[PDB]
Amino acid sequence: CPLMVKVLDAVRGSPAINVAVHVFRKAADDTWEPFASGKTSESGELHGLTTEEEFVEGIYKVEIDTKSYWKALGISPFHEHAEVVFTANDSGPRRYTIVALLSPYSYSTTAVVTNP
Amino acid sequence: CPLMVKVLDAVRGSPAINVAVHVFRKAADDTWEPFASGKTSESGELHGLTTEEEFVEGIYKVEIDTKSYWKALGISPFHEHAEVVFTANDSGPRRYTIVALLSPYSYSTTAVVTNP
Amino acid sequence: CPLMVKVLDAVRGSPAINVAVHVFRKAADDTWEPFASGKTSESGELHGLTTEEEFVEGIYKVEIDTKSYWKALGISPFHEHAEVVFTANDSGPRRYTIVALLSPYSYSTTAVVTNP
Amino acid sequence: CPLMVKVLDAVRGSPAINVAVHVFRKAADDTWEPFASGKTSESGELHGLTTEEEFVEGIYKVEIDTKSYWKALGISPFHEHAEVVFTANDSGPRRYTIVALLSPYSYSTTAVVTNP
């Protein structure tokens, strides 16, 4: 599982469930070509976005739809979304877990990168 | 006064100096128009990007060039950049401070929004 | 497993392995009585600190020895340790996961609290 | 100038006003001696705790009463308080800004340490 997203809710103290996540790869012309999406599970996790073979070196964008999450809880948010943009696999294939810690006016994104 | 960016280095506990920041605004056609740019000072702050009259309602994107900051310190960080995307001034003029806390594999962004 | 600690390293992008963790319960006289300790595993996790029966309502302190972790990596740290102090089980027994995101001059502690 | 505490509310994107802060210093016998105290102003800042001459080398503890802040807003938060424990001035006098970013189930603390 080369790419995993985990989302936590710092207001409720819970996994952030049903958060939509879209993944893009930067194209030759510098445009973003959306290619894996999903929604987080009851544990706040989204597994299964891509496979080893398809997840070649490149620049990737993970867009986490935080604004829809906070709207569905009735809480005003600041950001339109939380993006994470990174170059993948530059030194070989890696497994990436992106941990997003969400508050309405703040978030953090951390990568845990492990070698298979 | 209406938009200020503050960048801090969480490894050294210091302002992140000379960090490039580019601000864009979403046009009516949905493209990202360049809006303003600058670099952080010795205090890690970037003041003077815009004016109350030019900073009208809209969706703005702040991209902070965190990769070049780390690369100049010899580090190959995770994130290509830190980007903050938000609707501004939707209920009248506000002052926005965007705080970014940088680590090689993590970043934290917070908005402090005040009504002048 | 009523209490789990997960520690991440934002400088390397990895679980923080071999981090010492001590757990205390506040005594009747307001002193801290240390009672579960352990060290994080290769996944940055520490499971098995306490059991359902023993983890009664009370105020608990989790001390994470961040300073020793950063010293063992050769990196100067700011904090002596990261503490987390919380009242447990005030509305019934819960499972607590404490997520600590570590940088040398910054950290965050988040609780994910789930009902069994 | 030598110690300032800044507290921000990540739910509202605002300074956290009227937050009580107590500072202690570890004595030669290992007890925590009261050192100074104050409350955050309308800007979320607490200035004036100490002086360069009184703030000698030592281990200091800053406890921020985050629980009472949340309780006054109707919220039962996770943490009893946010406590920052650090050695100060070990290589000569420095200026310390302790930044705390608060959410009901998370807090982020960062030290910015400058040499005047």
Numbering used by the authors:
A (entry chain A), B (entry chain B), C (entry chain A), D (entry chain B): 10 to 125
How did the manuscript describe this experimental structure?
TTR is a homotetrameric plasma protein that carries L-thyroxine (T4)8 and vitamin A910. The TTR molecule is composed of four identical 127 amino acid subunits, named A, B, C and D. Each monomer consists of eight strands in a β-pleated sheet conformation. The weaker dimer-dimer interface defines two, largely unoccupied, funnel-shaped T4-binding sites. Pathogenic mutations affect the native TTR stability, facilitating the dissociation of the tetramer into monomers that, upon partial unfolding, aggregate into amyloid fibrils.
Here, we identified a novel A108V non-pathogenic mutation in a Portuguese subject. The crystal structure of this mutant and the characterization of its stability in vitro and in human plasma confirms TTR A108V as the third described natural variant displaying increased stability relative to TTR WT, being more stable in vitro than TTR T119M. In good agreement with the measured stability in plasma, TTR A108V was predicted to be 8.30 kcal.mol−1 more stable than the WT protein. This over-stabilization seemed to result from the projection of the additional methylene group of Val into the T4 binding channel at the tetrameric interface. In addition to the formation of these novel interactions, it is remarkable the reduction of the hydrophobic cavity that binds T4 and other hydrophobic compounds, which is partially occupied in our TTR variants by the aliphatic side chains of Val108 or Ile108, leading to formation of a much closer AC/BD interface in the tetrameric assembly. These different interfaces in the TTR variants result in the decrease of the distance between the methyl groups of Cδ1 of Leu17Symm with Cβ2 of Ala108 (at 7.80 Å distance), with Cγ2 of Val108 (at 4.25 Å distance), and with Cδ1 of Ile108 (at 3.58 Å distance). Likewise, whereas the dimer interface area between AB and CD remains unvariable, there is a significant increase in the AC/BD dimer-dimer contact area in the tetrameric assembly, with a relative increase of around 7% and 13% for the TTR A108V and TTR A108I mutant variants, respectively.
